[PDB]
C-alpha cells in the first residue's frame, strides 16, 4: 500500500527536496536533519536525537507501551540499540566522568 | 553489518564483475552497422595475422 515515492531516497541537496523529504518523514522542515553526506549510505533519513527509549515519558499513552513509540512517528536509526532491554542514555545523579574516576 | 558486508564485500566480487561485464558489453555491441568500418577492421585484422603469426 506504500507507494514508490514514500521510500527513503538519496541525500537531499536542494531546499525543495529537503522540504519534500521532511514532509515524507512526517516532521517539520526546521526539525528535519539528515546525516552528513559521507560515504556511508544513510542517504535521506532523519538523524534523530541519540536519546534512548527508556527515558521517554512513561505516562504518555503510547500506541506501543512497551517500546514507547507512536504509530507513524519517525523511528531512530538505532532503535534496536535502545529498546529498554539494552544500552540506555538516562541521565544519572552523578556525572559520567566523576563516576569513571571513582570506579577506576 | 553495513560497512563490510553490505558495502565492501558487495563491491569486491559481484558489483565489480557486473560493472566490467556491462561496460564490455556496451563497447562490443555499440556498432553503427556500417560495412565501411567492419571491412576496414577486417583489413587491419588480416594484416596482423600475416605479420604476427609467422
Amino acid at each position: 500500500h506504500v507507494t514508490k515515492d514514500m521510500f527513503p531516497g538519496p541525500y537531499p541537496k536542494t531546499p525543495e527536496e529537503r522540504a519534500a523529504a521532511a514532509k515524507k518523514y512526517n516532521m517539520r522542515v526546521e526539525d528535519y536533519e539528515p546525516y552528513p553526506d559521507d560515504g556511508m549510505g544513510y542517504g535521506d533519513y532523519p538523524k534523530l536525537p541519540d536519546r534512548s527509549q527508556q527515558e521517554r515519558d512513561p505516562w504518555y499513552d503510547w500506541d506501543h507501551p512497551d517500546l514507547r513509540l507512536n504509530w507513524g512517528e519517525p523511528i531512530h536509526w538505532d532503535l534496536d540499540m535502545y529498546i529498554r532491554n539494552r544500552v540506555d542514555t538516562s541521565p544519572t545523579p552523578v556525572s559520567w566522568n566523576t563516576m569513571c574516576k571513582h570506579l577506576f | 553489518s553495513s560497512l563490510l558486508d553490505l558495502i565492501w564485500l558487495e563491491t569486491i566480487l559481484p558489483k565489480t564483475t557486473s560493472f566490467i561485464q556491462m561496460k564490455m558489453s556496451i563497447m562490443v555491441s555499440n556498432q553503427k552497422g556500417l560495412i565501411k568500418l567492419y571491412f576496414l577492421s577486417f583489413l587491419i585484422t588480416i594484416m596482423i595475422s600475416m605479420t604476427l603469426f609467422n
Partner: protein
C-alpha cells in the same frame, strides 16, 4: 517500512567511495585477519620448534 528499508536495502545505492570509507573498510576488514594470522603463525612456529627440539613433554597426549 521506511526504517527497515533504510537499514537493509537503501545502503548501497547511497554508498560513495571516500577516503573515510576506504580507510575504515580496509582497516576493519583486513587488520584483524593479519593480526590473528601473525599471532597464530608465531604460536605454531614456536610449538613446532619446541617439538623438533624435543622439549615439550607431550606425555599422555593421545587424542588430538
Amino acid at each position: 517500512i521506511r526504517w527497515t528499508y533504510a537499514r537493509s536495502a537503501n545502503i548501497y545505492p547511497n554508498f560513495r567511495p571516500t577516503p573515510k570509507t576506504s580507510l575504515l573498510g580496509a582497516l576493519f576488514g583486513i587488520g584483524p585477519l593479519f593480526f590473528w594470522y601473525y599471532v597464530f603463525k608465531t604460536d605454531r612456529d614456536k610449538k613446532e620448534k619446541l617439538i623438533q627440539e624435543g622439549k615439550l613433554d607431550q606425555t599422555f597426549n593421545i587424542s588430538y
